[PDB]
Amino acid sequence: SGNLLQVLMSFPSLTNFLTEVLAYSNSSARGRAFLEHLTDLSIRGTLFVPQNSGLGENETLSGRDIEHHLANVSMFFYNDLVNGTTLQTRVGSKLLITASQDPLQPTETRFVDGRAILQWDIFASNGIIHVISRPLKAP
């Protein structure tokens, strides 16, 4: 499939974050540059996307919060992201992966800034998406 934006557009449960991204792009030059980055095939990124189960339509996010969902160095898959991994984001802050092994589970249970990961490793041509339980927050 397509770039990070196109893949985000392909999931009904991710429409509210998409709406925020698109509205941000039409709001400011910063917002437009963020959307252009998501569609740039010469970069790689890791985009954490809060699902509509934790983000409503009446919870307008700031541009800084939106951009903080993009770990902007490279694509980090499930099997790259161990306990204590810190990820630099586009706004200059850091996300923290925490992770332990419940021996019963088929995979490690992991969190990003304490948010549950609901789906790992959704591929895009210029990045990877992980769906999370609720939005991240820029400091």
Q: Locate tokens 């409503």: which residue?
A: 56
77 CB contacts (<8 Å, ≥6 apart)? 120, 121, 128
Question: Roughly how many angstroms between the first and final C-alpha of the chain, as a whole number?
Answer: 33
Note the resolution in Å, 1 decimal: 1.5
Q: How many CB atoms lie within 10 A of CB 24?
A: 21
Phi, psi of 13 (to 5 degrees): -80, -5
Token representation of residue 51: 């699902």
Q: Report the distance separating Cα 19 and Cα 104, nearest Å.
A: 38
Burial class (CB in 10 A: 0-12, 13-18, 19+), 5: buried
Angle at CA 90, nearest 5°, toward 22 and 111? 95
> Could you give the CA distance from residue 10 to residue 86 in angstroms, rounded to a whole number?
28
d(CA 49, CA 55) in angstroms, rounded, equals 10
119 bridge partner residues:
131
Phi, psi (deg, nearest 5) at residue 122: -90, 110
